């Protein structure tokens with residue numbers, strides 16, 4: 001029924017080497033995007049994650065999949081943004097994933113036309129002040 005949108009590239013303002021952003025769109029729920037393990041800085045958060053499609057595309061909802069074992073980096077408070085040209089970004093919604101260990105779905109009020117999505121991760125679960133991590137990020141159209 002629903003169509004999954006292909007993520008072709010992305011960026012992360014913080015990553016641990018070997019755990020860069022593309023590990024969250026490789027289709028494998030065991031591989032992780034993971035922010036830098038050096039999480040002691042006062043300005044460590046927020047962490048900004050950008051997911052890019054090939055072209056502007058119709059999108060109706062997204063699903064964030066946290067790591068399915070371990071508690072380091074489960075998203076908590078975020079701002080979700082998107083962009084129609086990959087450069088200029090528009091606030092979509094504030095979403096609090098609550099540090100949940102299960103998938104978090106966000107359904108948009110209306111279909112949006114996006115080439116890119118961006119997550120401003122303000123907080124995340126884990127040791128110390130927390131981390132940001134993601135097993136898979138998915139985007140769908142109805």
Ligand SMILES: CC(=O)N[C@H]1[C@H](OC[C@H]2O[C@H](O[C@H](C)[C@H](N)C(=O)O)[C@H](NC(C)=O)[C@@H](O[C@@H]3O[C@H](CO)[C@H](O)[C@H](O)[C@H]3O)[C@H]2O)O[C@H](CO)[C@@H](O)[C@@H]1O
Nearest residue numbers: 032034036037038067069070071072073126127128131133
């Ligand atoms: C024993 C020790 O050094 N404890 C310190 C504590 O370490 C936090 C650390 O604990 C576990 O890791 C151990 C060091 C060891 N490698 C192990 O496997 O037991 C956690 N691993 C597991 C499987 O539970 C570590 O989780 C990892 O953390 C990474 C980020 O650092 C990343 O998120 C990985 O994905 C994740 O598996 C981690 O929790 O740290 C405290 C304070 O920070 C210190 O006081 C202890 O001495």
Ligand SMILES: [Ca+2]
Nearest residue numbers: 023028031135
């Ligand atoms: Ca993955």
